[PDB]
Coordinates of C-alpha atoms in Angstrom, one line a residue:
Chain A
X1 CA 98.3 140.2 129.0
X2 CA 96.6 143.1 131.7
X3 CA 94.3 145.9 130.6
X4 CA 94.0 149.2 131.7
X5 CA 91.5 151.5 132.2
X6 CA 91.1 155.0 133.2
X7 CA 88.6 156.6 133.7
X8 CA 87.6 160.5 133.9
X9 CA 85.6 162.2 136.9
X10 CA 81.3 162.2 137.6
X11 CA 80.6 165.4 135.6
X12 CA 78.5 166.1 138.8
X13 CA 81.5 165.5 140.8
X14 CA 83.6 168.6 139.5
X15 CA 80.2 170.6 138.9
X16 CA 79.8 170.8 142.6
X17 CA 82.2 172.3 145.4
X18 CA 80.6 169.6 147.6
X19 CA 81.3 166.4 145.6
X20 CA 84.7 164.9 145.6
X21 CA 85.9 164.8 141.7
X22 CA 88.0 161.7 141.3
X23 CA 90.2 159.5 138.6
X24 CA 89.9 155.7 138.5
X25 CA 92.6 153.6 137.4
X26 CA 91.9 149.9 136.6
X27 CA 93.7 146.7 135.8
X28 CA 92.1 143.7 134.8
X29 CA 93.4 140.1 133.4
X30 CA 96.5 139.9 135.7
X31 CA 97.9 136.7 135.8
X32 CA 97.7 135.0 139.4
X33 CA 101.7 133.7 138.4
X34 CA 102.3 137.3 139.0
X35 CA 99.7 139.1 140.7
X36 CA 101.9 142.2 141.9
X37 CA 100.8 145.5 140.2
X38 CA 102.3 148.8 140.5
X39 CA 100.7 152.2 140.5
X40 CA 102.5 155.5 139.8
X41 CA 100.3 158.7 139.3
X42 CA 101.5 162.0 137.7
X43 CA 99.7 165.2 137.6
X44 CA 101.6 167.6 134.8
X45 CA 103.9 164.9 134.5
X46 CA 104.9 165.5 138.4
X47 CA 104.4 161.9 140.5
X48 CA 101.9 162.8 143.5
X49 CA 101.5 159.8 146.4
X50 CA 98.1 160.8 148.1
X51 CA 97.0 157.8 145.6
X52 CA 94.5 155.4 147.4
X53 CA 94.9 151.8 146.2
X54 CA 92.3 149.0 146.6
X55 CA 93.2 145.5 147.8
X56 CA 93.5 143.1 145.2
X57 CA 90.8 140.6 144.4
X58 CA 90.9 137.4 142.8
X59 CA 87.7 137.9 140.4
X60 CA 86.0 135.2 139.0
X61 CA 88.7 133.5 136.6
X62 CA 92.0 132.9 137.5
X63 CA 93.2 136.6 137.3
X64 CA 92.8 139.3 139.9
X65 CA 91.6 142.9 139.1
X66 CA 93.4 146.2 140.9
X67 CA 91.7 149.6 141.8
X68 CA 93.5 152.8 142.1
X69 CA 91.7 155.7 142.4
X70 CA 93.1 159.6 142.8
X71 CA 91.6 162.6 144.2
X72 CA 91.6 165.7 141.8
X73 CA 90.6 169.2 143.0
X74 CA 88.2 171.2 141.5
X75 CA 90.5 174.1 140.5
X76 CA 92.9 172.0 138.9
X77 CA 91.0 170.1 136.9
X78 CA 89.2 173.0 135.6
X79 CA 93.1 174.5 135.0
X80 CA 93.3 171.5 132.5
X81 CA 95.8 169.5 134.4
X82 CA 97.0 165.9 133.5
X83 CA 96.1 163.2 134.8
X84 CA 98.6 159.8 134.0
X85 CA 98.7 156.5 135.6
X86 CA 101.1 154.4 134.8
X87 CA 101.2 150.8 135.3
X88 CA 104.0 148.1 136.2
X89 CA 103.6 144.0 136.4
X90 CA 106.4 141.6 135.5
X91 CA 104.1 140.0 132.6
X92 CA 104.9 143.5 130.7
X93 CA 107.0 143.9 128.2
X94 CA 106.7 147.9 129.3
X95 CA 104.1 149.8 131.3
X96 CA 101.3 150.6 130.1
X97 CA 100.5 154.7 130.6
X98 CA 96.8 156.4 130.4
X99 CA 96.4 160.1 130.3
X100 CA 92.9 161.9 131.0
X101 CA 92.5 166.0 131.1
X102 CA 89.5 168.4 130.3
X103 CA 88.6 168.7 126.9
X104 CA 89.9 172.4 125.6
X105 CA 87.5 175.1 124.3
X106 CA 85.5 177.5 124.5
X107 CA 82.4 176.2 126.7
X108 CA 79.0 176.5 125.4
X109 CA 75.6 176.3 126.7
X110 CA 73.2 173.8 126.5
X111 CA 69.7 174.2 125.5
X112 CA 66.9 171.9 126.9
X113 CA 63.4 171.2 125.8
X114 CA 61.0 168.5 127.2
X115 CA 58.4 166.7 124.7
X116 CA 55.5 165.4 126.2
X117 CA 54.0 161.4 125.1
X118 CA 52.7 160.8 121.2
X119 CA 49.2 160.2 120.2
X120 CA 50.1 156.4 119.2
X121 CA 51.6 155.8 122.6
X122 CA 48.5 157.2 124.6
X123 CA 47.1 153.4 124.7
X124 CA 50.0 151.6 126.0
X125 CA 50.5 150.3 130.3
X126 CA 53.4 152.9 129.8
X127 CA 54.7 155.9 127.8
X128 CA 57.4 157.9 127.2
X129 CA 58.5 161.4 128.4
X130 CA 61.7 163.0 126.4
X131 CA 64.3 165.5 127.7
X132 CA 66.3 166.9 124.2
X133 CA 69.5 168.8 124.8
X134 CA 72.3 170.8 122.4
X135 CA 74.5 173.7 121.8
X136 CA 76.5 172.1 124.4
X137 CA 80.7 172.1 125.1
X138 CA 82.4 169.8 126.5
X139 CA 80.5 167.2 126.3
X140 CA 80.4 166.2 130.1
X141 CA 77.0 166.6 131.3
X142 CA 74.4 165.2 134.0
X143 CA 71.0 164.3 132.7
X144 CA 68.5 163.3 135.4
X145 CA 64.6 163.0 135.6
X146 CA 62.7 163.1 138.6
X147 CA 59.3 163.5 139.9
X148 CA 58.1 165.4 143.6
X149 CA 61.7 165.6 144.9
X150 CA 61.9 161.4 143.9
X151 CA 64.1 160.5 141.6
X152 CA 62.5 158.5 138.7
X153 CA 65.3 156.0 137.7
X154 CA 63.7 154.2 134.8
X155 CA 65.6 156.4 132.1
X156 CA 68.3 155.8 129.5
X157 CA 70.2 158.9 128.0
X158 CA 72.1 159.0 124.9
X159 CA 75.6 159.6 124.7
X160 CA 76.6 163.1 123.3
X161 CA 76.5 162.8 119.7
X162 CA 79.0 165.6 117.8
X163 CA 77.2 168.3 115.6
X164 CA 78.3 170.0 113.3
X165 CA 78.9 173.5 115.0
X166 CA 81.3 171.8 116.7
X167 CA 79.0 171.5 120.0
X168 CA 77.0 168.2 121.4
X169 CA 73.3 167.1 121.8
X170 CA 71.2 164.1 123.2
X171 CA 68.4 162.9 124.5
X172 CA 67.2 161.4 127.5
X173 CA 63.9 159.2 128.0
X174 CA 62.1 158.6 130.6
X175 CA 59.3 155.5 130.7
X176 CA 56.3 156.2 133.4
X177 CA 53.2 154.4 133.5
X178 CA 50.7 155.6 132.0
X179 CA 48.6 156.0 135.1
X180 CA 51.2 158.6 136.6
X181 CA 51.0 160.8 133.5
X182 CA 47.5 161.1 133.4
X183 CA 47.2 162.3 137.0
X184 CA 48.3 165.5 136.1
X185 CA 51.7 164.8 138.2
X186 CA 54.7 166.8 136.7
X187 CA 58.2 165.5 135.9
X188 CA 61.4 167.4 135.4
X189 CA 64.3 167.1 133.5
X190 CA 67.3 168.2 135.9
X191 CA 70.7 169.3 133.5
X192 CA 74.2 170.0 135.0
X193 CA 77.2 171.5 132.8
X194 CA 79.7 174.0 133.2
X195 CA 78.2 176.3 131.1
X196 CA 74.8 177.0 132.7
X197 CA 74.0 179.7 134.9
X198 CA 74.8 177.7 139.1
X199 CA 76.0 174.9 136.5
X200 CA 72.2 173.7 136.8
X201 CA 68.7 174.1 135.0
X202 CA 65.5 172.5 135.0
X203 CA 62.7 171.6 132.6
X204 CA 59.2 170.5 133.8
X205 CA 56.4 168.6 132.0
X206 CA 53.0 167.9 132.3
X207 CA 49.5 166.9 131.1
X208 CA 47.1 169.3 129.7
Chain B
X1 CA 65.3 180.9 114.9
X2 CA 64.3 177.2 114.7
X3 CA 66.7 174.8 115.9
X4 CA 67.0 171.0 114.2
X5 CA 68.2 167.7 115.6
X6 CA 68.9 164.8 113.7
X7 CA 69.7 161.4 115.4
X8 CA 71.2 158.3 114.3
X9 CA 69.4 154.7 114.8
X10 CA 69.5 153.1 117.9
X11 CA 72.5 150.4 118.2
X12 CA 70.3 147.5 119.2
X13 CA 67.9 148.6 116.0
X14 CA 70.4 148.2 113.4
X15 CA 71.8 145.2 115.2
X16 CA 68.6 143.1 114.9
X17 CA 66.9 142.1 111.4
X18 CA 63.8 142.1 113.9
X19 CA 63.8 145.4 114.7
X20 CA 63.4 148.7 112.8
X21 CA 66.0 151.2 112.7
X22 CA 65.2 154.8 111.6
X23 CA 66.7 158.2 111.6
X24 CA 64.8 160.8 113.1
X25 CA 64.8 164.8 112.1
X26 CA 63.5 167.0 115.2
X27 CA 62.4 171.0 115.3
X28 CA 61.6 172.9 117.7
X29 CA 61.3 176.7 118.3
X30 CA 59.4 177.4 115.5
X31 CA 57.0 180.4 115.8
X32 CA 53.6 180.9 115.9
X33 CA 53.9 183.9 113.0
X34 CA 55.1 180.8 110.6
X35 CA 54.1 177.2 111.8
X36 CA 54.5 175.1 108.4
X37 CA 57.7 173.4 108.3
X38 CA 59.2 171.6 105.3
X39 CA 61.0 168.2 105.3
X40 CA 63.3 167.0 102.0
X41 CA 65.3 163.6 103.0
X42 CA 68.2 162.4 100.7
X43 CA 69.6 159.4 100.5
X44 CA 73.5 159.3 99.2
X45 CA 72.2 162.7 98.2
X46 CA 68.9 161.5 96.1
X47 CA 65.7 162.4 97.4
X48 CA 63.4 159.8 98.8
X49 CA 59.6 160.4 99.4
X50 CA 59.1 157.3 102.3
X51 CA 59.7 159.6 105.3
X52 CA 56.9 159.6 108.1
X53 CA 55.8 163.2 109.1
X54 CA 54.2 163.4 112.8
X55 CA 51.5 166.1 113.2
X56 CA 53.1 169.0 114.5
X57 CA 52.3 170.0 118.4
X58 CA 51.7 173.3 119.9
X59 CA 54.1 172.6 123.1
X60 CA 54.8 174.2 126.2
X61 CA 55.8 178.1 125.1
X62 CA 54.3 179.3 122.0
X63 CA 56.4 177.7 119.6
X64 CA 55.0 174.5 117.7
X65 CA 57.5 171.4 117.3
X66 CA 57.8 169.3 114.3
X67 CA 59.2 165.3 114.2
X68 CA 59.4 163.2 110.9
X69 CA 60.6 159.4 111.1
X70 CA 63.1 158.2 108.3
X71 CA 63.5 154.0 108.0
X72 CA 66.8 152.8 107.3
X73 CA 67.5 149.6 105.9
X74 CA 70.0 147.5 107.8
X75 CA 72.0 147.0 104.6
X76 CA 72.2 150.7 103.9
X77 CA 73.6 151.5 107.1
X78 CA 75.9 149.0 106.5
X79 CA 76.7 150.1 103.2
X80 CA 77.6 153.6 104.9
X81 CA 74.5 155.6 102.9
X82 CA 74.7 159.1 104.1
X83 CA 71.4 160.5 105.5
X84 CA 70.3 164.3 105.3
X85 CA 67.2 166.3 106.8
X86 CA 66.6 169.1 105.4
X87 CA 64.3 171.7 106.9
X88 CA 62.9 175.0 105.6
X89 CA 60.5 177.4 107.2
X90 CA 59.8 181.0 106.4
X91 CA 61.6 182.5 109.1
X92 CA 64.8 180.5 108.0
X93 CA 67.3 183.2 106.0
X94 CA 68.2 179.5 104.2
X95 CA 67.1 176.1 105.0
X96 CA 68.6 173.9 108.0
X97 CA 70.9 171.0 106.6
X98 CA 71.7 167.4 109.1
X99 CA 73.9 164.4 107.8
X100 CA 74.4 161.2 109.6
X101 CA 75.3 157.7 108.3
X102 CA 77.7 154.9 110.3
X103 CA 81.5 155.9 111.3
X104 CA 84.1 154.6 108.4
X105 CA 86.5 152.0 110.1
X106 CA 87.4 148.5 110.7
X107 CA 85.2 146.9 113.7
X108 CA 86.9 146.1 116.7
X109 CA 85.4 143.5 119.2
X110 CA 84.3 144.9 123.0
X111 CA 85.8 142.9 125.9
X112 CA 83.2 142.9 128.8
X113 CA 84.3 142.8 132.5
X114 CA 81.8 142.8 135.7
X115 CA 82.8 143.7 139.0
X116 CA 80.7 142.7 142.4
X117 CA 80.3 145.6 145.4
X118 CA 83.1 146.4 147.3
X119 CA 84.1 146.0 150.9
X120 CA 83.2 149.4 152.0
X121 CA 79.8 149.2 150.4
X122 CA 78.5 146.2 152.2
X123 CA 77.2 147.9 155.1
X124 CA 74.2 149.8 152.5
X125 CA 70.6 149.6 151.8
X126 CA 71.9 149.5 148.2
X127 CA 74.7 148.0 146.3
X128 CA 76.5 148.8 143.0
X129 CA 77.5 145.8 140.2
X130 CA 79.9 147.5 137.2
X131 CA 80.1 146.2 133.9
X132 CA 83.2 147.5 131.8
X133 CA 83.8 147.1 128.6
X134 CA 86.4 148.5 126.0
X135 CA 88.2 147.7 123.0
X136 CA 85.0 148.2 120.8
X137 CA 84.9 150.1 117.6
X138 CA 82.5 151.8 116.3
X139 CA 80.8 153.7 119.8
X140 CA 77.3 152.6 118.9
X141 CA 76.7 149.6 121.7
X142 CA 73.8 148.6 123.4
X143 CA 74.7 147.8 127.2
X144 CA 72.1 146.5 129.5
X145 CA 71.3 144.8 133.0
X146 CA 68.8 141.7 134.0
X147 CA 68.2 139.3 136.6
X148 CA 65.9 136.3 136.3
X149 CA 65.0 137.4 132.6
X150 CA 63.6 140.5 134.0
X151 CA 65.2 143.9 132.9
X152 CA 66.9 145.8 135.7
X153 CA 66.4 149.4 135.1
X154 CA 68.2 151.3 137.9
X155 CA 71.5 151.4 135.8
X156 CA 73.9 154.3 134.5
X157 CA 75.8 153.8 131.6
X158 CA 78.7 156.0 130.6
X159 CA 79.1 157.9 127.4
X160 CA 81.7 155.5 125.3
X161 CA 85.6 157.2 125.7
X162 CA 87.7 156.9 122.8
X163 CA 91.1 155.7 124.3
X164 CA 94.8 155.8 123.2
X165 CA 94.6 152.8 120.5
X166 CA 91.2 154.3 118.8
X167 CA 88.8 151.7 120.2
X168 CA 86.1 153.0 122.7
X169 CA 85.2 152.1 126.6
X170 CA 82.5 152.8 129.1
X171 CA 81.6 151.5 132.7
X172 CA 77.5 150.2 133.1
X173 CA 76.8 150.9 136.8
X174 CA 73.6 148.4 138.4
X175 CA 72.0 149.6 141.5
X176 CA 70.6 147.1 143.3
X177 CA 68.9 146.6 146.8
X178 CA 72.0 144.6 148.7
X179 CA 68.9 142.1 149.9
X180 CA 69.2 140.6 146.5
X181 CA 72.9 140.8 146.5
X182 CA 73.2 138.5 149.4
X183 CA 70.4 136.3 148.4
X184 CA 72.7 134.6 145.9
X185 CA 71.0 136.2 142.7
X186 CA 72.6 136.4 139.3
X187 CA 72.8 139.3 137.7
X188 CA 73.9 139.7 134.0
X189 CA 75.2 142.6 131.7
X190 CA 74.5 142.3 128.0
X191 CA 76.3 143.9 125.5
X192 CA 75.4 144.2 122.1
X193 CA 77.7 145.4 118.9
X194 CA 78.4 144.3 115.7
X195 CA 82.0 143.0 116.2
X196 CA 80.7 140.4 118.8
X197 CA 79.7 137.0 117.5
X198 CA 75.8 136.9 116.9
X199 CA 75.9 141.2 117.5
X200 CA 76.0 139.1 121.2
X201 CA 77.5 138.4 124.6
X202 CA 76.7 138.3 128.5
X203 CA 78.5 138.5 131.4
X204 CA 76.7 136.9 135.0
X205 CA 77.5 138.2 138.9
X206 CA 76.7 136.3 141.8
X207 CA 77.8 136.1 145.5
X208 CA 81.1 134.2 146.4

């Protein structure tokens, strides 16, 4: 029988006045004897209807897959409202409800540092740059290298791992070649969480 | 004072009899006044001498950093042996204790989804593929994109959310140049965890 997804906002998105912060509801594996799904959204438990629903598609096998996706202002989510979307198809024996809300706490600051390529690594095509961050509550956070206003998209960061203060940590690696390192070009470490002074900082790194 | 990070083996490393999995115990912001910096690793709580100590680096403002490399044995990890770094350093009022090893719980298989571009997203420079998966106990999971055996690395993947029924999800965004979209090109998500059969599946995209 259907699945259900929902999924919280971009940690970007709510960081930022100018991004639109949203809630995705999904629904895969519905049948196509009974392709019909229903949508009802509740913030505090109250339904709201400014909803936007995707057409259906029939995706790849047999069954079609549903997008519903809901608009949450900034002020709200911060206010820790709920978010719930329930589901309805005839294939269920009841509908199935999701419920997503910031996490509660105190918020706490994240601390970044940036460690530059290893000895053993020097004589490879391409080496590594690392961006280490901690100390950090909630957990949602935007990680991003880039270099001379380009973004460098060749990075894969961690998901927060839970220490034992109660706060998070990661890292995030970046892989340049070689070449661009030892020009003397510099590469920063951009961080966004709720917690930072302009919910941004940066870290920069380079040779010598 | 000195701050320490410990982090857990990568997911595809302890996946893999070919690879080499390894805990690894990070310093930083220790002071020029006292640079020497002590490692003890335990093992289930017995000390073990086969820990790798890197030699430590006088980076950016300064404060020196220190990083020593413990291997794991895949069985061990398995076996749910406990792993603790301990640090000490002069200007430590007592030394810094870390502990990882892998989450208690019965393993629970990932079910992997992809989804091709929208409607409203056809008329780009650029495209976006989505890989979900959920379902999946414990959160370590390797998720990654390829086309044509080559690796695709302009992808985003979310931290894992623990959902209502204790099993984790994630979405794996691809960003591709919609040139290649159209041109009929497969593109496949691979997901690794131990639950799947072979630690292994895929998932392929292509247009129509």
């Amino acid at each position: 029988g259907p699945s259900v997804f929902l999924f919280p906002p971009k940690p970007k998105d709510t960081l930022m006045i100018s991004r639109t912060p949203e809630v995705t509801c999904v629904v895969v594996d519905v049948s196509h004897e009974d392709p019909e799904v229903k949508f009802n959204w509740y913030v505090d438990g109250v339904e709201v209807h400014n909803a936007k629903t995707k057409p259906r598609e029939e995706q790849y096998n047999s069954t079609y897959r549903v997008v519903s996706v809901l608009t949450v202002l900034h002020q709200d989510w911060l206010n820790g409202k709920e978010y719930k979307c329930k589901v309805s198809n005839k294939a269920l024996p009841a509908p199935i409800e999701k419920t997503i809300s910031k996490a509660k706490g105190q918020p706490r600051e994240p601390q970044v540092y940036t460690l530059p390529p290893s000895r053993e690594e020097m004589t490879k095509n391409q080496v590594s740059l690392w961006c280490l961050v901690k100390g950090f509550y909630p957990s949602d956070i935007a990680v991003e290298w880039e270099s001379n206003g380009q973004p460098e998209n060749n990075y894969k960061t961690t998901p927060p791992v839970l220490d034992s203060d109660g706060s998070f940590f990661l890292y995030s690696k970046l892989t340049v070649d070689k070449s661009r390192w030892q020009q003397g070009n510099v590469f920063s470490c951009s961080v966004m969480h709720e917690a930072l002074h302009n919910h941004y900082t940066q870290k920069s790194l380079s040779l010598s």
